């Protein structure tokens, strides 16, 4: 398994509107979690969840954002025995599949939310299940 | 897919020490989430997560706890098209596999926690990743 991971901003999910998104490259399966801020520890929390969902990957591709190049994240990945490659934001080889997942997720979130009567932000108490439904639907 | 679901109390995970545990009967895969209280909505939040991890099941077996027999939970399951069977707490046919999962999970949580130097409660900031690690290890 080789994953692509990024963060994408989704105000429908505010306050925890920073979505950490992983796509498994061979299967196209997605894992998404919500966060208040993009940080090294948010990335690590996200991947911990993703490992529990998909298994432990051999490698993860990210961009060169601080949250991915930090000593903390380097060490977390090493502790897990997961290889890491980084490129510039949006590079195709390492980020095009996760960027597609971002777009698919945002469209799905919008459609579900609007279907439930939410034309703008999703009420806080409804976000977790809606996000899980979007993940289910896409996978 | 037929699941067995229950709640089990794990003080190492306090304050959100109520663990909602699902086992997929054919694969023995487990999904676990943390909760502060056993409620109908906690069960629903748990299953929403479980569907995102395992897929939508045909049926779920639980005990006859309030959180499972409520109008709210009946309706949530119906909305999802998931059949439900209930029995007395601990009944074998519908709860023995999830009770085994409870025991496997609690042992794993203890071993991981003690390995990290936590002889009693796990620090709050460390619980989510430790729980995800336990789920990964068991699956």
Curated annotation (Swiss-Prot), chains A, B:
<comment type="function">
    <text>Catalyzes viral DNA integration into the host chromosome, by performing a series of DNA cutting and joining reactions. This recombination event is an essential step in the viral replication cycle. Has a strong preference for using the 3'-OH at the viral DNA end as a nucleophile.</text>
</comment>
<feature type="domain" description="Integrase catalytic">
    <location>
        <begin position="1"/>
        <end position="139"/>
    </location>
</feature>
<protein>
    <recommendedName>
        <fullName>Integrase</fullName>
    </recommendedName>
</protein>
<feature type="binding site">
    <location>
        <position position="6"/>
    </location>
    <ligand>
        <name>Mg(2+) 3</name>
    </ligand>
</feature>
<feature type="binding site">
    <location>
        <position position="63"/>
    </location>
    <ligand>
        <name>Mg(2+) 3</name>
    </ligand>
</feature>
<comment type="subunit">
    <text>Homodimer; further associates as a homooctamer.</text>
</comment>
<feature type="binding site">
    <location>
        <position position="99"/>
    </location>
    <ligand>
        <name>Mg(2+) 3</name>
    </ligand>
</feature>
């Amino acid at each position: 398994q080789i994953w692509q991971t990024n963060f994408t901003l989704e105000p429908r999910m505010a306050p925890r509107s920073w979505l950490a998104v992983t796509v498994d490259t061979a299967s196209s399966a997605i894992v998404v979690t919500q966060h208040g801020r993009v940080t090294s520890v948010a990335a690590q929390h996200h991947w911990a969840t993703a490992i529990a969902v998909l298994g432990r990957p051999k490698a993860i591709k990210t961009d060169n954002g601080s949250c991915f190049t930090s000593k903390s994240t380097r060490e977390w990945l090493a502790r897990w025995g997961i290889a890491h490659t980084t490129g510039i934001p949006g590079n195709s080889q390492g980020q095009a599949m996760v960027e597609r997942a971002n777009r698919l997720l945002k469209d799905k979130i919008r459609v579900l939310a609007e279907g439930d009567g939410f034309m703008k932000r999703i009420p806080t108490s409804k976000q977790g299940e809606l996000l899980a439904k979007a993940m289910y639907a896409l996978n």
